[PDB]
C-alpha cells in the first residue's frame, strides 16, 4: 500500500495473508468470507506470463495478522488449503478479466477478536454503494512504494472513479468485471495498492446496516500511485453467482 497508514488492531479481521511455504515469503492478500472459505485474486495463484502456477500444497493461509513478518503467537491462525478454485473464464492472457479465485480450508478457522469474516454484497448494496466518489478501503502488506516493505498491515481509503475516467487512464481493455479507484491528480490526496497487495479486499461500510462489505479485489494497476493512473479491482458482485455456485457445490 502506497501513501496509506498503519492499520489499527482488529481493523480488518477478514484480512488474510497468502504465504509461500518455500521460500517463505508473502504472496498476496486475501479475505475471509466464512470459517472455511477464503477469497483472493486468480492471478495470485495462476499467472503464466510470470511462470506462476501454485498448487494447494505450495501455500499457507495466515489469518488474524497485523505484523507482516512476525509469527504472531496466540493471535494469528495458520490454515492449510484443501482446494483452489479459479474462475473458469479468468483471462490471464489479456487483461485479467474475472480475476477471482476461492480457496477452501482443510479445517474451519476459529473466529476471535482478530479473525472475522467480511460480508459479500447483494445486488442492492452493490447498486447503492458502487458509485463514483464513494470511498472504499484497501488493506495489505504490499510494497510502500512502486520502486520498502511495511512492519504492519497498511490501510488506505480511496474513492471509486467514473468509468470513462478509468477507461481513459489506460490502454488496457476494461470490462464490467472491473472497477477502478484512486484520487485524481487535481484532488491532491494520494494512495494506491501495490505489488503484494493483490488478492486483498476493497471494502465499504454500508451506511444502511453498518456492516462491512467486500466490493472489490486488488487486481492490477500501471505502476503504483502514479498521477493519472488508478488501481483496478475485481468487481465482486458481478462474479457472485460464480462464488455461490462453487460454495454450494463444494462447501
Amino acid at each position: 500500500i502506497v501513501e496509506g497508514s498503519d492499520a489499527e488492531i482488529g481493523m480488518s479481521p477478514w484480512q488474510v495473508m497468502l504465504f509461500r511455504k518455500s521460500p517463505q515469503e508473502l504472496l498476496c492478500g486475501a479475505s475471509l468470507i466464512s470459517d472455511r472459505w477464503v477469497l483472493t485474486a486468480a492471478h495470485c495463484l495462476l499467472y503464466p506470463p510470470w511462470d506462476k502456477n501454485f498448487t494447494e500444497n505450495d501455500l499457507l493461509v495466515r489469518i488474524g495478522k497485523h505484523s507482516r513478518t512476525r509469527y504472531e503467537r496466540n493471535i494469528e491462525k495458520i490454515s492449510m488449503l484443501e482446494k483452489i478454485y479459479i474462475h473458469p473464464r479468468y483471462n490471464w492472457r489479456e487483461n485479467l478479466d474475472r480475476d477471482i479465485a476461492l480457496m477452501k480450508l482443510k479445517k474451519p478457522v476459529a473466529f476471535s477478536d482478530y479473525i472475522h469474516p467480511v460480508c459479500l454484497p447483494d445486488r442492492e448494496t452493490a447498486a447503492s454503494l458502487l458509485q463514483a466518489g464513494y470511498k472504499g478501503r484497501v488493506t495489505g502488506w504490499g510494497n510502500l512504494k512502486e520502486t520498502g516493505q511495511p512492519s504492519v498491515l497498511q490501510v488506505v481509503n480511496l474513492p471509486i472513479v467514473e468509468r470513462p475516467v478509468c477507461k481513459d487512464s489506460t490502454r488496457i481493455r476494461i470490462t464490467d468485471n472491473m472497477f477502478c479507484a484512486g484520487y485524481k491528480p487535481d484532488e491532491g490526496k494520494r494512495g494506491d495498492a501495490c505489488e503484494g497487495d493483490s488478492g486483498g479486499p476493497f471494502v465499504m461500510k454500508s451506511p444502511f446496516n453498518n456492516r462491512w462489505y467486500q466490493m472489490g479485489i486488488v487486481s492490477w494497476g500501471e505502476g503504483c500511485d502514479r498521477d493519472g493512473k488508478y488501481g483496478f479491482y475485481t468487481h465482486v458482485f458481478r462474479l457472485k453467482k460464480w462464488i455461490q455456485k462453487v460454495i454450494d457445490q463444494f462447501g
Partner: peptide
Amino acid sequence: EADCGLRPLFEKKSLEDKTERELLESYI
C-alpha cells in the same frame, strides 16, 4: 454468515476506527 462484517473490536463494542467516518462522508 449472519454476523459477517461486524468487527469484534469496533462495531461489536460500538467503537469507531479512526477513518471510517471518511467513508461515511463520501456516501452522499
